Amino acid sequence: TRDANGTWEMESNENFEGWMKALDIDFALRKIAVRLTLTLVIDQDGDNFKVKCTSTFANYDVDFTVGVEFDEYTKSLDNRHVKALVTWEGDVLVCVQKGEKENRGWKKWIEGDKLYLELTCGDQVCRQVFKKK
Ligand SMILES: *C/C=C/c1ccc2c(c1)C(C)(C)c1cc(N(CC)CC)ccc1-2
């Protein structure tokens, strides 16, 4: 479905390390990140999205409108400037972040009370699954 609203709790997280390594995240912050609980809160009204990812130590919040390019500065991730664009490819929510890294972005599939998330950077894909709280 297109409706991604909800509080989403992580069920699984595969190749998180490899993805963070492809983004050049400090080996320090990687070790912290693998231990922290991650809650994904999405607020969706029409084309307008507010996404908040929250750990005990890190917040990653981004707001966007589907179909409208936006400049992004990944301050609490790898601290790069990208040109981001989120679109629908059928029911798949796709994000393409143009910049230094190739193949960079993420795809979200909402299947009922499950959310599947693939994050990509270079030749690395991290695969996550959340359950609606
Ligand atoms: C639809 C999901 C997109 C998206 C963008 C940015 C991040 C995420 C998902 C998370 C939840 C995978 C995430 C986690 C983090 N750290 C903790 C807050 C871990 C590296 C940063 C950015 C994003």
From Swiss-Prot:
All-trans-retinol binds at residues 40, 108. This is Retinol-binding protein 2. Higher expression in adult small intestine and to a much lesser extent in fetal kidney. It comes from Homo sapiens (Human). Belongs to the calycin superfamily. Fatty-acid binding protein (FABP) family. Its main location: cytoplasm. Intracellular transport of retinol. Transmembrane segments: none annotated. It is found in: Cytoplasm. GO terms for molecular function: fatty acid binding; molecular carrier activity; retinal binding; retinoid binding; retinol binding. GO terms for cellular component: cytosol; nucleus. Forms a beta-barrel structure that accommodates hydrophobic ligands in its interior. PROSITE patterns: FABP (PS00214). InterPro entries: Calycin (IPR012674), Fatty_acid-bd (IPR000463), ILBP (IPR031259), Lipocln_cytosolic_FA-bd_dom (IPR000566).
